[PDB]
């Protein structure tokens, strides 16, 4: 019932108890582990609120206080009446910070308590949503000195009045399907790049076109808005060695702002809650650039390095993969845009784990995602045993809106 | 109950039914995943159904399920169990069992080779000297002058747990590690404890950086004995780099034959506690883990200095850079000396094919993503994007406690 995790590089053992407060399910059973699978009423509502308020009041050392007891009946009454309830701002902020704190797949959680929370629950229209989103982008971007942020739009009522940001991230590059067979721009967004057109977007059918926002307020049809370019910070990618690197014509945006997840707090569902932090270098250089189903520039780069690509055994891909990532980090740092390398981030996470085990009794973590997509075993997290379990408040995945939307 | 895995690079979706045949537990539950936890005397009572499940398996594979040969064998094993409290496997069953334990090994990326396994039956062995002989023959057969051949040598099964055969070494061939008084380590840090045992057991350590450890062999529950593998049987490869000429001067070499010797092989409820086995190296085992783990030879810095990398910021990825070059060297040296090795791209690619074949011909393929994905360049190998299901089938290879921790000393 009380669990030990060992780090095999340092022999340090930690003891986990936090998992005992887990309420949601993993997907695994005693007969089968699903650790590498990508995606596994007033009745329901009241214990959920209670559990949350219990956490919350415990966290401010007023467990079993009048304020506590009072808030509990107050919420209970409101549920009885309205069949839902509203969070106080303090609870909203606490809830959002803790959804981040509990995100078992996020290596960046040492920053969790410094989250700027923007309350957009008063928002009613797609234009309103756009305004709030532009403000988020400008604040978080902060001229390159990035600051984490989340903007929280009104909670689900009857699932027919949902607020949804249709983009997967606030800022992403378009992808169009060619006659040449392949794909210009970003293959991951070919379908979304299509749906923008299907609703009226004018694509400059280029390679790195910042996609428009597709905003759904209150269950209505979504609307197109162009993010002001002066708000979209971008970074041109050059190698501090290969002077030819620049002619590949690569750039990337500085702000990673995931916009399609669901924030759950005390049973309440926030279907539109775009949030942002800053990039770990490998996200762009390894995944975005070198994934086969993405920008897939490995061959091209390798050509320009005149490497022996005759056999897998020369490790040409590996050699190039490193240089590319050196360039990403180089470009960002030179342009003074916040970025972190996988060594620093993982080092920070181990420190964060130590802290969480110490002050909270543990830290849910998904090794499959915490370990970076390159040079895994030379980062400390590779040798770190981790326990994965689901805590609430949480960020959850949710179905793409075009599949659900009753037009 | 059917289960689907998706490859997110190819959208290829597969359906697992094999997981239904799983008996053993994973460690995980509905509320916690232990997927990254490293390591998470049996009665006639529980033995028979285990024998029966094995024998049903075996007779199905040979397409004789429900035959009279099947039924008589079950009867024979039943009688032998209740009479003697255990039973002996036929050679055929032993071979089938060893192959399938390999086949069921969810953490092994090399399983496409599982059906080509040379099984050496050492169940007639009675002494440590006998064990040394068998092991020498294994090493010689498996090495084959550099054209490596997979093999397993199987010593007598456990009886009352007081008469175990064990190979105390973790691998048949490994380098000594020596802790110095100044706290530094000479040789392979991983083998310090084992090196000390050997020394205490009377091994004269030459105390160099690459000393092949002696074999420490336990027969029939007796105290273990020391033997030196004949040097001419130990194939080694000097490590050089195809472009960096200073690399040779780092003084590195490695042995060609990876031969894990401390696992327990389980077949039909019988436990084979000494079953050393060998295949060949995937390059990163040596180039990434053995050389570059901080708790191993840890040569990243010295390599990095000599390539003149910016070692001032991690952000320069000097570590990543040196890591690749070292792995380039390992592959280069082995191929140059015609010693079988496989790069991580080739191995992972072959595994994906194996896996798909296994889903179709067998209904599934248990696989441990945490272990299948290579320790460098993870996402540019196809396994990274492959959803996998992990579950335990028998026959299987299992860990067992280190024998110095359990052994009852006779003196
Ligand atoms: C501030 C610096 C941050 C860094 C360096 C960082 C890093 C990462 C990385 C590398 C991943 C792996 C995802 C992938 O490879 O696609 C991840 C996942 C994730 N991050 Fe963080 N992140 C940061 C901030 C945040 C913030 C501010 C939030 C929310 C408020 C957040 C929530 C999440 C969630 C929910 C996931 C996984 C989603 C899932 O369940 O699959 N992160 N992060
Ligand atoms: C023939 C070439 C082979 C290759 C390239 C190969 C590759 C690997 C690799 C890279 C690992 C990961 C272990 C680590 O990184 O420490 C592994 C694990 C494993 N292999 Fe293979 N292997 C081969 C042959 C074999 C054979 C012949 C057997 C048994 C008959 C076997 C049984 C296992 C088992 C049981 C594990 C899990 C080890 C553990 O959980 O500690 N392998 N293999
Ligand atoms: C299941 N599925 C189809 C899927 C999986 C992953 C993704 C990509 N978002 C992962 C993420 C989240 C938050 C992040 C925060 C900061 C950062 N620097 N990076 C972050 C990256 C999209 C879709
Ligand atoms: C602490 N722990 C549980 C642990 C972890 C790793 C190891 C290292 N041996 C793993 C192995 C097994 C079989 C192999 C077969 C062929 C090959 N080319 N390589 C193989 C590598 C030992 C023990
Ligand atoms: C804690 C963690 O599970 C442990 O370090 C594992 C990770 N994956 C691995 N994968 C392989 N192939 N070999 C290993 O030793 C490990 N170690
Ligand atoms: C199949 C597998 O689960 C999938 O490729 C995962 C593996 N680990 C990952 N890790 C991170 N950080 N991001 C990812 O998208 C993935 N993808
Ligand atoms: Zn699991």
């Amino acid at each position: 019932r009380f669990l030990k995790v060992k780090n095999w590089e340092t022999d340090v053992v930690l003891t986990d108890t936090l998992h005992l407060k887990s309420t949601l399910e993993t997907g695994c059973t005693e007969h089968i582990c699903m650790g590498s699978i990508m995606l596994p009423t007033k009745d329901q509502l009241f214990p959920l609120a209670k559990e949350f308020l219990d956490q919350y009041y415990s966290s401010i050392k007023r467990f079993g206080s009048k304020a506590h007891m009072d808030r509990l009946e107050e919420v209970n009454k409101e549920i009885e009446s309205t069949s839902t309830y509203q969070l106080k701002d303090t609870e909203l902020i606490y809830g959002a910070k803790h959804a981040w704190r509990n995100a078992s797949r996020c290596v960046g959680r040492i920053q969790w308590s410094k989250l700027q929370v923007f309350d957009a629950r008063d928002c009613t229209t797609a234009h309103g949503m756009f305004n709030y989103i532009c403000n988020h982008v400008k604040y978080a971007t902060n001229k390159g000195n990035l600051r984490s942020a989340i903007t929280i739009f009104p909670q689900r009522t009857d699932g027919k009045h949902d607020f949804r940001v249709w983009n997967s991230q606030l800022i992403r590059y378009a992808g169009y399907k060619q006659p040449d067979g392949s794909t210009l721009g970003d293959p991951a967004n070919v379908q979304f790049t299509e749906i923008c057109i299907q609703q009226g977007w004018k694509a400059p059918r280029g390679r790195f076109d910042v996609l428009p926002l597709l905003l759904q307020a209150n269950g209505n049809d979504p609307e197109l808005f162009q993010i002001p370019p002066e708000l979209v910070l971008e970074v041109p990618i050059r190698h501090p060695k290969f002077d030819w690197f620049k002619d590949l014509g690569l750039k990337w945006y500085g702000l990673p702002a995931v916009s399609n997840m669901l924030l759950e707090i005390g049973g309440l569902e926030f279907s539109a809650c775009p949030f942002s932090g800053w990039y770990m270098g490998t996200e762009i250089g390894v995944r975005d650039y070198c994934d086969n189903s993405r920008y897939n520039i490995l061959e091209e780069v390798a050509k320009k390095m005149d490497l022996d690509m005759r056999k897998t055994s020369s490790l040409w891909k590996d050699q190039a993969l490193v240089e590319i990532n050196i360039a990403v980090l180089y470009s960002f740092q030179s342009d003074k845009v916040t970025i972190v390398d996988h060594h620093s981030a993982t080092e920070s996470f181990i420190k964060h784990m130590e802290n969480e085990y110490r002050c909270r009794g543990g830290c849910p973590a998904d090794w499959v995602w915490i370990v970076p997509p390159m040079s895994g075993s030379i980062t400390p997290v590779f040798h770190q045993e981790m326990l994965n379990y689901r805590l609430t408040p949480s960020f959850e995945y949710q179905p793409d809106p075009w599949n659900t939307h009753v037009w």
Side-chain angles (χ1 to χ4, degrees), chain A:
Chain A
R1 187 191 179 96
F2 295 20
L3 293 171
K4 307 259 195 65
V5 293
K6 172 172 175 186
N7 180 292
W8 292 81
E9 208 203 318
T10 69
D11 289 282
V12 170
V13 191
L14 307 167
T15 322
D16 192 290
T17 36
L18 179 57
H19 64 284
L20 297 166
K21 308 167 187 295
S22 162
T23 53
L24 297 154
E25 298 166 11
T26 60
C28 300
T29 70
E30 307 96 42
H31 290 62
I32 179 173
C33 171
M34 298 209 144
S36 61
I37 304 298
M38 194 96 67
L39 295 164
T41 78
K42 314 177 187 193
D43 295 336
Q44 297 149 349
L45 194 42
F46 186 58
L48 289 178
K50 184 168 194 304
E51 185 224 309
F52 173 70
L53 295 171
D54 280 11
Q55 302 181 28
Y56 174 67
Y57 278 94
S58 163
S59 77
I60 68 193
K61 294 187 309 184
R62 294 191 120 68
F63 194 85
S65 72
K66 223 187 94 287
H68 185 184
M69 294 309 110
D70 286 338
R71 177 63 177 140
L72 206 162
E73 33 151 352
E74 175 176 50
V75 173
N76 196 351
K77 289 177 192 166
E78 174 175 352
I79 288 163
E80 283 288 352
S81 288
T82 55
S83 83
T84 173
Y85 73 106
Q86 303 292 324
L87 296 174
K88 298 230 179 294
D89 306 348
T90 57
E91 303 167 344
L92 186 73
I93 294 156
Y94 171 92
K97 285 176 173 186
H98 276 72
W100 184 8
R101 195 183 188 171
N102 303 335
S104 72
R105 290 186 161 165
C106 177
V107 73
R109 290 177 274 161
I110 190 173
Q111 290 292 305
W112 76 266
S113 65
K114 302 200 306 214
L115 186 66
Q116 183 60 222
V117 173
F118 294 113
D119 187 353
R121 293 176 287 169
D122 67 350
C123 186
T124 65
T125 68
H127 285 76
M129 289 180 68
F130 175 64
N131 189 35
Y132 266 113
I133 287 169
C134 285
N135 289 348
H136 181 130
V137 165
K138 181 165 181 169
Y139 174 86
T141 296
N142 193 30
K143 293 186 171 302
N145 188 11
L146 308 205
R147 303 177 282 190
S148 298
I150 179 160
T151 294
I152 302 162
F153 293 105
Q155 72 209 36
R156 169 170 294 137
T157 48
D158 49 40
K160 248 71 187 173
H161 304 343
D162 283 10
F163 287 72
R164 295 287 314 260
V165 171
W166 287 35
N167 319 46
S168 48
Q169 298 176 43
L170 300 179
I171 300 177
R172 279 191 102 171
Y173 299 122
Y176 330 82
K177 280 190 137 291
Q178 289 274 51
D180 184 34
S182 102
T183 290
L184 179 68
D186 199 324
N189 301 313
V190 160
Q191 180 186 9
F192 187 75
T193 304
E194 285 184 49
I195 290 202
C196 297
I197 290 157
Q198 188 179 354
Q199 283 282 112
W201 192 45
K202 174 177 72 195
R205 290 185 94 92
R207 192 189 186 190
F208 290 128
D209 303 330
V210 183
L211 280 168
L213 299 163
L214 230 215
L215 299 188
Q216 170 184 316
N218 212 35
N220 306 326
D221 282 15
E223 306 184 31
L224 284 176
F225 302 89
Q226 169 189 10
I227 304 183
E230 61 272 25
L231 300 194
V232 185
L233 173 49
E234 289 177 299
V235 171
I237 306 303
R238 60 269 187 195
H239 199 296
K241 220 119 257 36
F242 300 148
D243 297 337
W244 55 255
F245 208 106
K246 66 180 100 309
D247 294 324
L248 276 122
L250 313 161
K251 57 175 169 186
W252 207 256
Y253 48 95
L255 191 74
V258 172
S259 58
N260 61 2
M261 301 194 76
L262 195 150
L263 167 55
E264 179 173 85
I265 300 168
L268 302 179
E269 314 200 303
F270 296 95
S271 50
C273 54
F275 59 82
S276 64
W278 52 82
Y279 264 121
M280 178 158 83
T282 51
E283 288 180 272
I284 309 174
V286 181
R287 301 310 313 283
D288 297 335
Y289 280 165
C290 295
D291 263 17
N292 268 283
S293 61
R294 298 293 301 286
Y295 277 90
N296 193 38
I297 64 168
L298 273 175
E299 319 170 61
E300 168 171 355
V301 175
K303 257 71 120 65
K304 286 239 179 174
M305 302 175 75
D306 212 344
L307 300 172
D308 203 323
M309 304 165 53
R310 288 176 284 192
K311 338 171 278 68
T312 62
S313 347
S314 61
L315 306 192
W316 58 271
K317 291 185 159 178
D318 307 72
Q319 212 146 30
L321 181 65
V322 176
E323 296 304 325
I324 294 180
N325 278 267
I326 276 168
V328 167
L329 296 170
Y330 182 70
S331 303
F332 269 64
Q333 283 164 131
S334 288
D335 283 5
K336 238 78 57 46
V337 185
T338 309
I339 192 157
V340 65
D341 64 75
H342 49 293
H343 302 288
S344 177
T346 55
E347 200 214 348
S348 289
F349 186 79
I350 295 295
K351 210 161 181 187
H352 173 62
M353 276 192 72
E354 258 98 277
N355 293 334
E356 295 294 77
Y357 271 79
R358 180 171 47 93
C359 305
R360 192 186 194 195
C363 176
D366 185 344
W367 190 104
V368 169
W369 289 63
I370 301 297
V371 176
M374 77 179 268
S375 300
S377 83
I378 61 163
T379 66
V381 291
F382 183 91
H383 314 264
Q384 181 67 55
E385 293 187 341
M386 313 176 188
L387 285 166
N388 192 25
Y389 46 93
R390 314 223 323 182
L391 298 173
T392 196
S394 65
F395 291 105
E396 294 301 329
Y397 282 116
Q398 82 188 311
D400 283 339
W402 49 91
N403 308 331
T404 354
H405 191 38
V406 237
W407 290 84

